[PDB]
Design a protein around this nucleic acid. Structure first.
Ligand SMILES: [K+]
Ligand SMILES: [K+]
Ligand SMILES: [K+]
Ligand SMILES: [K+]
Ligand SMILES: [K+]
Ligand SMILES: [K+]
Ligand SMILES: [Mg+2]
Ligand SMILES: [Mg+2]
Ligand SMILES: [Mg+2]
Ligand SMILES: [Mg+2]
Ligand SMILES: [Mg+2]
Ligand SMILES: [Mg+2]
Ligand SMILES: [Mg+2]
Ligand SMILES: [Mg+2]
Ligand SMILES: [Mg+2]
Ligand SMILES: [Mg+2]
Ligand SMILES: [Mg+2]
Ligand SMILES: [Mg+2]
Ligand SMILES: [Mg+2]
Ligand SMILES: [Mg+2]
Ligand SMILES: [Mg+2]
Ligand SMILES: [Mg+2]
Ligand SMILES: [Mg+2]
Ligand SMILES: [Mg+2]
Ligand SMILES: [Mg+2]
Ligand SMILES: [Mg+2]
Ligand SMILES: [Mg+2]
Ligand SMILES: [Mg+2]
Ligand SMILES: [Mg+2]
Ligand SMILES: [Mg+2]
Ligand SMILES: [Mg+2]
Ligand SMILES: [Mg+2]
Ligand SMILES: [Mg+2]
Ligand SMILES: [Mg+2]
Ligand SMILES: [Mg+2]
Ligand SMILES: [Mg+2]
Ligand SMILES: [Mg+2]
Ligand SMILES: [Mg+2]
Ligand SMILES: [Mg+2]
Ligand SMILES: [Mg+2]
Ligand SMILES: [Mg+2]
Ligand SMILES: [Mg+2]
Ligand SMILES: [Mg+2]
Ligand SMILES: [Mg+2]
Ligand SMILES: [Mg+2]
Ligand SMILES: [Mg+2]
Ligand SMILES: [Mg+2]
Ligand SMILES: [Mg+2]
Ligand SMILES: [Mg+2]
Ligand SMILES: [Mg+2]
Ligand SMILES: [Mg+2]
Ligand SMILES: [Mg+2]
Ligand SMILES: [Mg+2]
Ligand SMILES: [Mg+2]
Ligand SMILES: [Mg+2]
Ligand SMILES: [Mg+2]
Ligand SMILES: [Mg+2]
Ligand SMILES: [Mg+2]
Ligand SMILES: [Mg+2]
Ligand SMILES: [Mg+2]
Ligand SMILES: [Mg+2]
Ligand SMILES: [Mg+2]
Lengths: 44, 274
RNA sequence: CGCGGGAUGGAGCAGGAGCUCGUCGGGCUCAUAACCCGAAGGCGGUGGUUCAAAUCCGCCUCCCGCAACCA
RNA sequence: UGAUAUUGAAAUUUUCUAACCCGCACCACUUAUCGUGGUGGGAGACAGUGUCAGGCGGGCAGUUUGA
RNA sequence: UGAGUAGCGAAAGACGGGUGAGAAUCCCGUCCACCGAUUGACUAAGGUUUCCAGAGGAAGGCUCGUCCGCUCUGGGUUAGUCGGGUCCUAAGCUGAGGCCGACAGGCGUAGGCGAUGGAUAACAGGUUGAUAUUCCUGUACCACCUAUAUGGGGGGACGCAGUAGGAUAGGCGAAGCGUGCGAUUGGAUGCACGUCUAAGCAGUAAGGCUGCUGAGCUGUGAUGGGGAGAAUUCGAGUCGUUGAUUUCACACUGCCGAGAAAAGCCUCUAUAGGUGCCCGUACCGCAAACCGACACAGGUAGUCAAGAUGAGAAUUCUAAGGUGAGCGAGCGAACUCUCGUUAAGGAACUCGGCAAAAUGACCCCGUAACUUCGGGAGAAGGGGUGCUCUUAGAGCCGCAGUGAAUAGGCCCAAGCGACUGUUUAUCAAAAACACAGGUCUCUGCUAAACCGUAAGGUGAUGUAUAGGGGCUGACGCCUGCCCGGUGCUGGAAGGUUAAGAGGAGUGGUUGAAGCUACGAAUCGAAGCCCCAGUAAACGGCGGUCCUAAGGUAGCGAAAUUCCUUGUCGGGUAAGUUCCGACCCGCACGAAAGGCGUAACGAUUUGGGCACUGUCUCAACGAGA
RNA sequence: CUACCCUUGGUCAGGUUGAAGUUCAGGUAACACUGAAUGGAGGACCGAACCGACUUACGUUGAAAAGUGAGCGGAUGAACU
RNA sequence: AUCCUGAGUACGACGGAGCACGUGAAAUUCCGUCGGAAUCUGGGAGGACCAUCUCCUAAGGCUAAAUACUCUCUAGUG
RNA sequence: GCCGGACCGGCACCA
């Protein structure tokens, strides 16, 4: 059966990547939250 | 003329089509073509704002000269051609300086005819003139609403208007809908009636042909749910069940007039269409 | 099975008893009908409230309307 | 839908132009269907917009709908 | 605990030899078996070292393990030409100025980014444990470098179907050549394979179009290579037939639904030497490495496409190649599952013929009611297929000849829906939705409608033969009455009302004025009250009385009928279902359409034939 | 993932039926009309790939959190990808 | 007190808001719309408002400290 | 309750 996750390097980077997060105010809020929590990984 | 298909299949039963006899050239003028991607009833936000639009055959736009603002130069009708973007056929005309333009093809126009535009042009089918120089009683089409803007009225297949009178700086015209209204006398119109008169006689015949034309199915409100439509819900089939039939957005949709008041054309419209 | 409404000259309707048709007598007509003129004739019942009851109290004998279910 | 502000000028609703408006034409910025200016044309103290007011308003909302 | 219980995830293995502490499970060999429009081969995504060699056996592997996609150590991916960038644009995204918006921000012009498309120069052979159009060999091509010698136009550039051809690839046959082999089972002297070689460069060329184009062929490339082969040297590349799904080529014809852009490119205003970057390249890849928690019977785009049989990429057996499936050994109980057969009967089973049986290919006869004249139709129902010989006959054999496998069951009647299509991913595929067609209504264009606070948009680069919304739902015949109520449309300014205008007048305070709190006539819109019209608007179509008016046509115990298994007829031996009638319509009825309707249906319902383990009534056999 | 849409690509073994036109022949005053051949239309027919999911059996601490076996619907289109 | 001393301001009407205070007899402060003063013989406030008295002098600006907090640093505490 | 006609018709209605 076809499952929900169909990985795609380009789609992953374009939707969840660092530059996409930077492009919006709320995305920069995401990055700030992860930096505050101390995450090793900030984005895709 | 109209050709009626034999009932070889249930789909072909009662189906009719135009024979396209009046079409002389089956290919368009390359230099007058522009791309025309489909919007499918979706606006700049990406949201669907007009229902029942989508799909359909790919089309290329033909640049049409609605303005007819090339005066004093005779143009010869090169061909009559199919236009997927409008009900009327179009005419490829070649001016004496070699420039080629597309015009709405009027009824009775033929290959080799000479057309012209301007105040001094003769009253003949295909000639474009200001409404000030068109005699009363003349059948016209492609009528401007503002000088130099280009024809906006009576462009559909078989559409025409009759010049009724000349009052001051305005000309009284009767439109296809029956409404009689004033139009600035410096506005231009083309002599004659738009061709392709049998366009309206076509029996589409099957659902697929509408799909080719790009029309997606219409779902009746009464077979929806209450959260979708005021006509939704009810056990089994249901009548309207409210004082007036409703649009999907909760507005009365049978007889309720929607033309706004305080329009500048209120003083220009003499008789309503009804 | 629960709730409610009705019983008016002979007929259909009004409602502390009148309109129309029906009957009788006379007239008009060759005769009948139609028509015209006069006369008579009535609160479904059973008990009570009431100075006094078609009228109000409850019930009785039928008809009529809504409803008689969630399993 | 009315008042009032933007909002002016003359007759007695009509007129005018100059504010305001034009998903109107031409020109320039400019290899530009945006915009901004310029000129014409249309319209015009109306419209639009602000404030106040009356009306409509299951289109949408918060709730009530006893024992 | 359940319990040494369930399970150990589709299937064919056997033996010999080896290794080893230990072997059904690892390696080698022989035989056997399975796939083969694929279990074969090659691209892409995705994964990211899983790739290779040596070593190892704790844990992982549903058993075992000496083995591994596991552990340890060391390795492996080579490009001017392949794919991408240093080229082009599509949707879309972004956007200098700009427009809009409490903020945050939204939009948008020029421009820019952006392949799934356009442009663009390299082939063949060899080689490793692991890379190869990348390394090597031979032979090329492209861009640039050095020396000798900006506007116009065109083009790119395009759909779908079908047909007739040319060529080539590929298949087949003869063996023309070549290479082998030549048989201890009765016989013969026949048996089995091979039969090629690119880009580039010159010559040419079937065609096609109105000179331009054009598949392909020939030579060269190539005393090179590769080769069925013999013991490093030597070795054949020929005749016929068939023939593409490839290519000429979206060339030609036809059709309506009318089929990108931009750049590269075109056109008008030699030789010689040298240089040539970055990213990817391992491996898996219809899967044990991807998505499914798994070494999971699932899902995963494209390409290549052999023989016999055949219409076929169907069927069965095979080729190339790959595989024997990560628990086994016995036994051959019940019971369960998957298969095969079955006396006599043949739907008696059951809610219901559910399931199964039956039909089935090709060729020839032959084919009804009804019909929208197309259909219905493969209607139905019947005949023939083997092999040998002669040139349609004569023979031969079997129980049986499309001898296997694969390949419609059919008929009669009724409800519903015209039809193909769509739907509740995961209990409903339908009579529901859609539909072509009909009608009503809105909308004169900065249209109406819709999204958005707006700007900006969709509608539409459309313009009443157009666009939006409501209802109905092919087609045929048709669609009756009611405008009193509600809605909608149009009148009227008579009454009623708000802000605002207006100030009669009254009080507080100081005889006042002043300040102050109120404040009455009168004016002041839409709406409403009123009138009219409108039913394919919402609705309504009763009980002499009343109403706005009391059901026309057609249909009717119906997908509607409660009584009810109404009554009568047909069908059965027997029929609460079915069909045909009646009308007493609890409680049909004309676009929430009425009545019919050929064709269509994995629709619902009744009957019949064929057929059968559905059943009387079970029995035996195969496998898990 | 799924619904719908936008741009740009790709795919559909084989059989069957035989629409419109055209030509020839009859026929006419001229048309209508007719037969034969040609032609190859269709949300056409049968049926693989492919897309579905009607029935049934199995599975129901599954091989699988929706599957498998056998039949079944569509299969040039409102097709699938 | 001859001159100057903050004008679309103060203030008012309407609609709101902030004031403990829900429009209330609601003073006092602010916003939008519209109107709109006076000038030391002036102007504002003392909880509607008037008068008297009392206090003050809006419509310009600047101004440490006592106050709030702890991701930190230094030294310590329970 | 406020008002216009002959109760009717609009408006008003926060113990
Ligand atoms: K990759
Ligand atoms: K046993
Ligand atoms: K319409
Ligand atoms: K009405
Ligand atoms: K597509
Ligand atoms: K106030
Ligand atoms: Mg629509
Ligand atoms: Mg529904
Ligand atoms: Mg609703
Ligand atoms: Mg309803
Ligand atoms: Mg109902
Ligand atoms: Mg509600
Ligand atoms: Mg609450
Ligand atoms: Mg209770
Ligand atoms: Mg235990
Ligand atoms: Mg045991
Ligand atoms: Mg046990
Ligand atoms: Mg056991
Ligand atoms: Mg077991
Ligand atoms: Mg296994
Ligand atoms: Mg494979
Ligand atoms: Mg390995
Ligand atoms: Mg183990
Ligand atoms: Mg390893
Ligand atoms: Mg933008
Ligand atoms: Mg390799
Ligand atoms: Mg590789
Ligand atoms: Mg993994
Ligand atoms: Mg798997
Ligand atoms: Mg799979
Ligand atoms: Mg697939
Ligand atoms: Mg096969
Ligand atoms: Mg395994
Ligand atoms: Mg038997
Ligand atoms: Mg037998
Ligand atoms: Mg039998
Ligand atoms: Mg039986
Ligand atoms: Mg029985
Ligand atoms: Mg069956
Ligand atoms: Mg067969
Ligand atoms: Mg259907
Ligand atoms: Mg269907
Ligand atoms: Mg379901
Ligand atoms: Mg289902
Ligand atoms: Mg319907
Ligand atoms: Mg009326
Ligand atoms: Mg009427
Ligand atoms: Mg009943
Ligand atoms: Mg009905
Ligand atoms: Mg009707
Ligand atoms: Mg109706
Ligand atoms: Mg119907
Ligand atoms: Mg059967
Ligand atoms: Mg067994
Ligand atoms: Mg293929
Ligand atoms: Mg079909
Ligand atoms: Mg089929
Ligand atoms: Mg589905
Ligand atoms: Mg299946
Ligand atoms: Mg079928
Ligand atoms: Mg004050
Ligand atoms: Mg001051």
């Amino acid at each position: 059966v076809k499952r929900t996750y169909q990985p795609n390097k380009r789609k992953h980077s374009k939707v969840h990547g660092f530059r996409k997060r930077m492009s919006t105010k709320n995305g920069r809020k995401v990055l700030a939250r992860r930096r505050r929590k101390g995450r090793k990984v900030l984005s895709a | 003329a109209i050709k009626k298909y034999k009932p070889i299949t249930n789909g072909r039963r009662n189906m009719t089509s135009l024979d396209f006899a009046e079409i002389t050239k089956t290919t368009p003028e390359k230099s007058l073509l522009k791309p025309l991607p489909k919007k499918a009833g979706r606006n700049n936000q990406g949201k669907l704002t007009v229902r029942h639009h989508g799909g359909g055959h790919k089309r290329q736009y033909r640049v049409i000269d609605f303005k007819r603002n090339k005066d004093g130069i005779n143009a010869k009708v090169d061909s009559i051609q199919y236009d997927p973007n409008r009900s009327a056929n179009i005419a490829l005309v070649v001016y004496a300086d070699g420039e080629k333009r597309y015009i709405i093809a009027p009824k009775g126009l033929e290959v080799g005819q000479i057309v012209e535009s301007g105040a001094e042009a003769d009253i003949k089918v295909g000639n474009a003139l200001p409404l000030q120089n068109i005699p009363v009683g003349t059948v016209v089409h492609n009528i401007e609403l503002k000088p130099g803007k280009g024809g906006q009225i009576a462009r559909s297949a078989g559409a025409s208007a009759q010049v009724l009178g000349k009052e001051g700086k305005y000309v009284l015209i009767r439109l296809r809908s029956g409404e009689v209204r004033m139009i600035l006398s410096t506005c231009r119109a083309t002599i004659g009636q738009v061709g392709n008169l049998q366009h309206e006689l076509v029996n589409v015949g099957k659902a697929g042909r509408s799909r080719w034309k790009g029309i997606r199915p219409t779902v009746r409100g009464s077979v929806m749910n209450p959260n979708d439509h005021p006509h939704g819900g009810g056990e089994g089939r249901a009548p309207i069940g409210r004082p007036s039939p409703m649009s999907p957005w909760g507005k009365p949709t049978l007889g309720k007039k929607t033309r706004r008041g305080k329009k500048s054309s209120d003083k220009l419209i003499v008789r309503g269409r009804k």
